Amino acid sequence: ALKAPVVVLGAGLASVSFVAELRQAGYQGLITVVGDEAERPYDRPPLSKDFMAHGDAEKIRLDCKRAPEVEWLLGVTAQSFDPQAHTVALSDGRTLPYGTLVLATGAAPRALPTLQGATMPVHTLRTLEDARRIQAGLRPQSRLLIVGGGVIGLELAATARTAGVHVSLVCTGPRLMSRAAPATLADFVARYHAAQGVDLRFERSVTGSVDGVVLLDDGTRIAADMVVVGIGVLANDALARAAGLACDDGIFVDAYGRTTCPDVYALGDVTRQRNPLSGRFERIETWSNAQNQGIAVARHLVDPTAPGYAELPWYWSDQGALRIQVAGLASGDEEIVRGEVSLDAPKFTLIELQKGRIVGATCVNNARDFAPLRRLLAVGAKPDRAALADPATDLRKLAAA
Amino acid sequence: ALKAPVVVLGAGLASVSFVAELRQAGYQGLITVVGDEAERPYDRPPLSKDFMAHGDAEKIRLDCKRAPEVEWLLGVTAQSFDPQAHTVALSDGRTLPYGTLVLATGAAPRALPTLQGATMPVHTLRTLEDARRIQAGLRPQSRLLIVGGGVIGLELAATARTAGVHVSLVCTGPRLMSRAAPATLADFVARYHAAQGVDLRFERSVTGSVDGVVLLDDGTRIAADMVVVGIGVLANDALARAAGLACDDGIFVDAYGRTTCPDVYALGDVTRQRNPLSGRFERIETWSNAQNQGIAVARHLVDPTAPGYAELPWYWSDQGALRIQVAGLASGDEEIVRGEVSLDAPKFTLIELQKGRIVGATCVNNARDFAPLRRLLAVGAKPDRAALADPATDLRKLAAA
Ligand SMILES: Cc1cc2nc3c(=O)[nH]c(=O)nc-3n(C[C@H](O)[C@H](O)[C@H](O)COP(=O)(O)OP(=O)(O)OC[C@H]3O[C@@H](n4cnc5c(N)ncnc54)[C@H](O)[C@@H]3O)c2cc1C
Ligand SMILES: Cc1cc2nc3c(=O)[nH]c(=O)nc-3n(C[C@H](O)[C@H](O)[C@H](O)COP(=O)(O)OP(=O)(O)OC[C@H]3O[C@@H](n4cnc5c(N)ncnc54)[C@H](O)[C@@H]3O)c2cc1C
């Protein structure tokens, strides 16, 4: 079952979390990790936040201390694996044997086909190298265009505005943060960015570019010194596809992290997996999933009596003065708003319910509310709705009961 | 790998096809099939066609001759399996051991929530028992309402009209056959059924029913003596879900039929699998898939050097005077129409292309065209488009080259 030696492809958060948990749970056999980036393993959330602002990569490294006795092959690409021979072929000419193979290869930014032949700077934001490249162009008074309405682009927008960069943004949908965010939150976030000087363009798509100017499908133009494309990511599942595993923009896994190929597991951004709230398969693109799924899969490999992965989804986003936290589903049949939604010292909580049951929550500048809401969410609590709205109501009280 | 004994859950076409191929390929170990219906294994397409018209079940049985030495446990339900103990628990109190387990449990009609408490006859059409029940109510001059725009309901509509039954049909979408059928075909099919006296209602949903009358979301009413609901099917994947396999309205499998649980395979209507034309996972609800996937999975189990399942999708439908055949994708960036589309002796062919490459085809009353088109489709042919349209062009010529 858990058969030595263990080989992990990818050296991001999911991989680090997984191998640390293998060691902590008591597995003492060989562990080898193959990472294509020639970088000490690092966390990605800082890249559009404090790193983009302050540039010190030695503040963003992952702690591999809880993963002793691991050989990290950095700057090496796994090119294929043979699931019958139980081997992995590396770009440096070597081959690794495995008893258990774990695919933790993440996802890469989608390219925008209409900007393929662009003759102006066009970047995406995924890696430390990407971040350094973009930062090297955040000249004060320069003009940045962001393509996409997702959180990473908005975090970059906020960082850029703080640095004195003019920012425009084009969004194909009618609202920002179309994925996994309540409409009430999305509408407020737009109001915030607009108030901070971001030039927002909704329901627009990029049709091309000419001599430093981007073209839109309404027949208009946006000049910029740099374009950062952030229209989502695609799973890095090429090795899995070639080896015959079930994949569809993501490697299908069950709650034990098993793929359709025996002795091969997958975790993190590369996986398509069950969302227990919706009961549907989804590719879950969050820090908490990478860590939590990695830990759960490792724990169950060492101890088969352990339950499968069961954590509910959540993420956070730091956008200027907004500290955003979102858990569970974006919507249900009811939203309860705790507090006022205002640009004057923003602070509020949203709760989404389905037939009385909490299925999601949002906190903006209220971390203290978020933890008890996540616990209520976890057991599908059906609290008193007026109490949920009432500001006199304390939420940590409810969760404890 | 192929480990004896083999146990198959379900005794439909996929199961029969699979076990016959195991035997033909040379596997001589135990095979036991568990089938919940107390019926000699039978084919479903006749149920909305000649059986509905003529009633002889001994014309619709599957040939189990190519599957010698198989014990068929008919009228028995598999209630669970334990993938660690390698056992299956049966409704009759017995337990079966397995080396290889194959889930071939098909799919069941979706219920219509708004008709849940109906006090008038409401049926679905999946089984021989369903067909006999519906047929027992096809009184000449009676009124039948069909809910859904799919092929099975339309086949029933045609059968009913031929039998002198008044037929009305409510479709939530703007067109019939929304799944896997070109719009040109769907529009023609509506014209045909309307000409045969079917009362078609598009963009309408059922909101409920009262004392023999069905209510619609436009505030109107349709009286009927019987309602047949045909709004699609849901995979019978409950055993897989309970046992920890990756599922989402269908058991995920790769081209070898492997699930995420070692030693457990799945085939047929119950599976969610790669469509090689779209490159996306889909639940493929066709006779040809059930047979072809069953055969391919069996062949590769006995001979691991055999390729995985690779057949492209296709189906047929018999609707009164229309003998419809459809292969591949419903659309691309071009449709070529061979012949005229007319209610006067209907006979035409559609070809769908994507950047010059054939990705789909349709034949109405032209079986001779369909086989060569499927071969051209299979190798992604890029034929001369004017020739494809030209009636002087023979298609069997093209395929042979
Ligand atoms: C800029 C940015 C900001 C983010 N902010 C937040 C946030 O505030 N909150 C939040 O919840 N989430 C955030 N995320 C999301 C989060 O960081 C991801 O969910 C997480 O990185 C996924 O981890 P992973 O280990 O699955 O994948 P990855 O981090 O992508 O790691 C995979 C690694 O495998 C490598 N690899 C791929 N193929 C091969 C191969 N064949 N051989 C060897 N190596 C290979 C990759 O190049 C990569 O280094 C952010 C992400 C980015 C990019
Ligand atoms: C009325 C009708 C007309 C059709 N016409 C056409 C057509 O003209 N062309 C076409 O391409 N396709 C047609 N089809 C589709 C086609 O018949 C299906 O694709 C095919 O039946 C799928 O085969 P299967 O073996 O995967 O599933 P099934 O035929 O559903 O067989 C599965 C069996 O497993 C049983 N089972 C489920 N759970 C358990 C359990 N726990 N224990 C034991 N047994 C269990 C089921 O009850 C069932 O008997 C038609 C289907 C119907 C219903």
Characterization of this structure:
The structure is a homodimer of 401-residue chains. Chain A is of the alpha/beta class and 401 residues long. Chain A folds into 3 domains: 1-106 and 235-313, 3-Layer(bba) Sandwich (FAD/NAD(P)-binding domain); 110-232, FAD/NAD(P)-binding domain, CATH 3.50.50; 314-401, 2-Layer Sandwich (Enolase-like, domain 1). In chain A, 24% of the residues lie in helices and 29% in strands. Chain A is built from 10 helices and 26 strands. Chain A has a 5-stranded parallel sheet, with no helix packed on it. A 5-stranded parallel sheet of chain A has the order 9-16-10-11-12, with helices on one face. In chain A, strand 14 (213-216) and strand 15 (221-223) form a beta hairpin. In chain A, helix 1 packs parallel to helix 7. The longest helix of chain A is centred in the C-terminal third of the chain and has 16 residues, at 287-302. Chain A is globular. Chains A and B meet through loops of A and loops of B. The complex binds flavin-adenine dinucleotide (2 copies). Residues 9-15, 34-37, 44-45, 47-48, 77-78, 104-107, 125-126, 152, 236, 239, 268-269, 285-288, 290, 315-317 of chain A line the site of one flavin-adenine dinucleotide (FAD).
